[PDB]
Ligand binder design. Structure first.
Ligand code: DHE
Ligand code: DHE
Ligand code: HEC
Ligand code: HEC
Ligand code: CYN
Ligand code: CYN
Lengths: 539, 541
């Protein structure tokens, strides 16, 4: 009773300022569920799970009830020119569905599940114990020249032999694998699905097999392994969209060790954000750290793993909407893109600070980027864009080229907007640029190639999809990727699930068609990751 | 712009729609009925159950659990309570049967949402009353600043500066509502006070008359404020912790300018699950590194917030035990001895090696305040704490160097008057150990304090009738917090009576245990915490 009188006083919170959420249009269970289904299928990507807004404006009841039924129906129908699709004019949704959507967004956002240690441990499985795994490579595959290709809609990945151009193994994974990363030893392949399911594959077994699996959230995109000297196969980190968090695991077994929330304050307005999605993650070579990108808040986190029991995190402020990125030629500066801010942030992994914020074109999408030595400007890092056809060249040498350090030194022009990946190699004199999401079929079905020994000359259009000889379907071409020795570039002809797809290989020295990989199992090929080039960050 | 970026994010979310739940199936209640219940909730239930009803000292009152219990179960539990900390709202006749029904219906609805409080709101509340350049260069008064006391006048929303030697009120200043604590800056010039409403006030003790130079509001609800104490950082930064929103804020220690706000929402130490309301508790400034040691309650984390580079903040998260509350330094100012009250443990944080040294098992609901340090004739240097759940006083060894066999062990135990204790106190020059019993259900015990002889710890305590000595008449007259003067010969107590009744500050001669003086004033409304300037600034306890 002592402890009851002790916590007996009134809260300092004014009850009048604590608000009841309602005044929404009545809808039955059948009507609400149909609407909720359309929301996660068509709208959550841009508006967020909690509707607080990401690429899209906030769709919370305070804002939507203010607009009213008619406004909302009209906006969902015609869309806007600033990136909001027309759901009615395009005939994607019916008048009835749009009315249900307008009604839905006026209600309190339904609550999604959380995912902590109990759920993570429950999903954790060690298929082959470390003690019972091989001691050496029991197969005769050229592992450094292997490719980890994502078979998207099939929820699988295929290991394609670089030299023979054949599928060696097809493995069951999580749904729609986003990326593939290698461990610092070059033995373990790590893949993560968008469903946040991670699979660890031992390339040393007679036939490459899965040794462990875990689910780190409801939705995720990135996975990474420790790369600092003395920490080979020590830790594995993964970043989640829902819940806004990241997880550090044991690099041998995938045992969940630490989970850290990314819910916090923004860099720009310094206000609370309930859904800061984790984007790109890159392992530092300078300090025993993981460089984690937190999107909506525009924060770059340096997560130290020297002591994972008492975690040290340095929160570097950058720019809103941090997405993808990669290392400069020297592997010290993390060049990441803050896409909706139309900027590229430079993170010094050595001095542990923001070196600069470089203004580029509309919606920069570098992937990991493309590094080469410019004849006039010295070492540069490049990126193409989704919002326009420009290619930005940024100086990456503060030591021997201060005049050009962190400056958008020059621009190149591609086929158009909708570009996703730019690529080059140390042993190559070519620069490749795709145009995957470009509204024109011909442009999206081809890639642009520049001559690094003559950047004044226009690019050469390579008819990648046409060379594949596939027939019907959108046949969008995505991601240029080189092999171990850098003499051939691979492309994915991403066609629909019920259609035929292929991987097209081009001879880098001659710009001619070298090979075409077709297989009935090659369903919806997206990302391709060459083992050597991924492990040693060769871009 | 356009169509390319629309297909790029055109794919479906990996989230299963079927798993995202719609909340309702709650009893229909009108606006007047909902607001009447919501009023009672924040007045009587929020402290223990939390603002979002996810549970703190109290169990979760989220729709999933309450709708499962049903209307009748809820009405019965709110009426009779339980023996595990849940009050009997109906049996005691505190709430009417009609109010209890409204409450039962209320907790079955989705918890209403409070506002957030970020930088726009903080800057809007930020005021510089006297600019640094316009402030004095020397002390413009004849006040004995080191021996001044900063007494909280709770319900009045004010503080009072009482001269240690004369026993008179020098100045009454308008502050935030119900000031929780007073802290001094490292220079000894500025007095920092924070209200439970999260309003901070910075007072210059060097002006003609001690006046306010700056103010700011760091949240909707708060408890702690602190200043940077590492060498080379005098008056550099001021930090404050909030209950709602779950956050802390770092400000300029000269102007109170908001620089950084950090969310404490995160994963727990025990279950490693997400918690949407981790309240900030005690904050203490490190002398070993340029850091602030912040306690995060519900998650049970002790954060080492480095302020060397305030633009790129570095935080080290140390796991301790759930329900971290109050604490203080050991005799050497190296080990932060903090209580995880509902876990019945005292955590030891090494501020030098930056790690958890131990988790000592103590009694029921430890409440140390800042604690009491003295050298035990047998066990060596110790740190003590009294309890709310029982009458025991735990003595914990704090010397790993010369007494490793006793380090981080509940070495011995002393017995007080009973439960409901809040503060234990001693001083270097003193051979006495004082312990209050503020919240003890018996009137006579709560109106008195216990005193132990440090020279002969085997002997039983002496009872000092503090409230009786005050001669105040009617009222609860609960006695709270023993605090010494700079010399260590006087021990002050607060006779915390009701706002409409008469209160007093009782001073005792430590050398003789006899009544020295009584401070009465019509402005001395609901006195609670008293902080001696020198003793607060230099952590003398
Ligand atoms: C955060 C993130 C990364 C960086 C991780 C890293 O490197 O650590 C990444 C990388 C990638 C990479 C890495 C390439 C590389 O060379 O590094 C690939 C192949 C890729 C294929 C696609 N991505 Fe990706 N991608 C997202 C997020 C991300 N993608 C999205 O949220 C988005 C906008 C919407 C979505 O529906 O997922 C999106 C669209 C796409 C696609 O449409 C692609 C072509 C097919 C798909 O499955 O969704 N993303
Ligand atoms: C977090 C916290 C601290 C440590 C801060 C620090 O040192 O940095 C503290 C310290 C304190 C101290 C510090 C004394 C010291 O010497 O260190 C005092 C005087 C004090 C007066 C009270 N506290 Fe306190 N107090 C709370 C929280 C805290 N109190 C509560 O949440 C609680 C349980 C409920 C509430 O109503 O706020 C509570 C009850 C009380 C009281 O009932 C007191 C007596 C009167 C009041 O105004 O609420 N608390
Ligand atoms: C991204 C590729 C989008 C998808 C998928 C959907 N929306 Fe969206 N929406 C998006 C943007 C970038 C904007 C901003 C518009 C602007 O011109 O600034 C919006 C806006 C809306 C709004 C209006 C908010 C307001 O102004 O009050 C609504 C009502 C809206 N969007 C609804 C919505 C629904 C229900 C969708 C799925 C069926 C949907 N959007 C998809 C971007 C994108
Ligand atoms: C702390 C000093 C309390 C105050 C003030 C209130 N409650 Fe509480 N409550 C508290 C505890 C420690 C517990 C646990 C009881 C146990 O024996 O374990 C509870 C529990 C409840 C519950 C039951 C939850 C369940 O098991 O389903 C209810 C319905 C409840 N409390 C409601 C409630 C209301 C409405 C109050 C204010 C008018 C209130 N509590 C205050 C501690 C404390
Ligand atoms: C992915 N972009
Ligand atoms: C305060 N206790």
């Amino acid at each position: 009773k002592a402890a009851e009188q002790y916590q007996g006083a009134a809260s300092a919170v004014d009850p009048a300022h604590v608000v009841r959420t309602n005044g929404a249009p009545d809808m039955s269970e059948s009507e609400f569920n149909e609407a909720k289904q359309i929301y996660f299928q068509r709208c959550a990507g841009c508006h967020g799970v909690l509707r607080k807004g990401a690429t899209g404006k906030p769709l919370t009841p305070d804002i939507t009830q203010q607009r009213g039924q008619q406004y909302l129906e009209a906006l969902i129908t015609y869309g806007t020119p600033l990136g909001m699709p027309n759901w009615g004019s395009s005939g994607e949704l019916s008048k009835e569905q749009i009315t249900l959507m307008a009604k839905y967004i006026q209600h309190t956002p339904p609550q999604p599940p959380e995912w902590g240690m109990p759920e993570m441990r429950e999903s954790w499985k060690v298929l082959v114990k470390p003690e019972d795994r091989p001691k050496k490579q029991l197969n005769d595959l050229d592992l450094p020249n292997l490719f980890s290709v994502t078979l998207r809609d099939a929820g699988q990945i295929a290991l394609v032999d670089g030299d023979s151009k054949k599928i060696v193994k097809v493995i069951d994974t999580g749904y729609a694998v986003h990326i593939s990363r290698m461990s610092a030893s070059g033995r373990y392949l790590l893949v993560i699905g968008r469903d946040a399911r991670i699979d660890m594959i031992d390339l040393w077994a007679k036939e490459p097999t899965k040794v462990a699996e875990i689910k780190i959230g409801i939705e995720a995109r990135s996975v990474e392994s420790s790369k600092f000297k003395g920490y080979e196969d020590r830790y594995t980190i993964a970043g989640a969209y829902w819940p806004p968090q990241f997880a550090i695991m044991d690099g041998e077994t995938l045992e969940p060790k630490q989970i850290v929330s990314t819910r916090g304050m923004t860099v720009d307005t310094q206000t609370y954000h309930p859904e800061p999605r984790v984007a790109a993650i890159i392992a530092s070579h300078e300090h025993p750290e993981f460089i984690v990108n937190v999107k909506e808040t525009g924060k770059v986190l340096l997560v130290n793993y020297k002591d994972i029991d008492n975690l040290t995190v340095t929160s570097i402020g950058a720019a809103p909407f941090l997405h993808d990125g990669g290392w400069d030629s020297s592997h010290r500066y993390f060049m990441t893109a803050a896409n909706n801010s139309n900027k590229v942030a430079v993170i010094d992994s050595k001095d542990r600070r923001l070196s600069a914020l470089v203004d580029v074109g509309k919606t920069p999408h570098p992937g990991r980027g493309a590094n080469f030595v410019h004849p006039k400007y010295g070492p540069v890092w490049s990126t193409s864009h989704l919002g326009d056809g420009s290619i930005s060249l940024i100086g990456t040498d503060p030591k021997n080229h201060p005049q050009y350090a962190w400056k958008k030194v020059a621009e190149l022009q591609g086929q158009g907007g909708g570009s996703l990946f730019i690529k080059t190699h140390p042993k190559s004199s070519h620069l490749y640029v795709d145009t995957t999401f470009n509204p024109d079929a011909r442009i999206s079905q081809s890639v642009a190639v520049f001559d690094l020994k003559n950047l004044d000359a226009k690019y050469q259009v390579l008819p990648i999809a046409e060379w594949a000889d596939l027939g019907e379907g959108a046949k969008r071409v995505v991601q240029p990727e080189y092999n171990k020795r850098g003499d051939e570039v691979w492309f994915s002809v991403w066609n629909g699930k019920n259609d035929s797809s292929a991987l097209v290989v081009v001879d880098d020295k001659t710009l001619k068609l070298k090979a075409v990989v077709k297989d009935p199992r090659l369903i919806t090929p997206t990302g391709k990751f060459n083992v050597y080039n991924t492990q040693h960050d060769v871009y």
